[PDB]
């Protein structure tokens, strides 16, 4: 035996790596109708697939 005791390589010790999870959260964003800017007027020529404004 030895005067100093330790359990590293092989011994019945305690303590481990905890595992936990976070509760489900949903991100909510508001689509503001302003701040979209504007260029030109009625077509004319308009970019294809552009968002209607």
């Amino acid at each position: 035996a030895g005067g100093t005791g330790g359990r590293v390589f092989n011994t019945i010790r305690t303590e481990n790596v905890p595992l936990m999870t976070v509760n489900g959260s949903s991100f909510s964003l508001s689509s503001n109708t302003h701040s979209h800017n504007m260029v030109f007027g009625r077509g004319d020529a308009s970019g294809h697939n552009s968002s209607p404004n």
Partner: protein, 54 residues
């Protein structure tokens, strides 16, 4: 080092009546090891010498 359960001095008539009797603390450890070294056996640095306080 001498160990005895009788509370009589070594120089007393009841005791052997020779030599000086002094109180001894702790148990005598054989010169070579000092005890606790390494968890897994590797061994620490022991202490030696007589009367030396370390």
């Amino acid at each position: 080092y001498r160990i005895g359960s009788y509370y009589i001095t070594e120089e007393d008539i009841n005791p052997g009546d020779s030599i000086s009797l002094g109180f001894g603390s702790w148990a005598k450890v054989t010169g070579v090891i000092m005890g606790t070294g390494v968890v897994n056996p590797d061994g620490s640095v022991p202490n030696a010498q007589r009367v030396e306080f370390q």
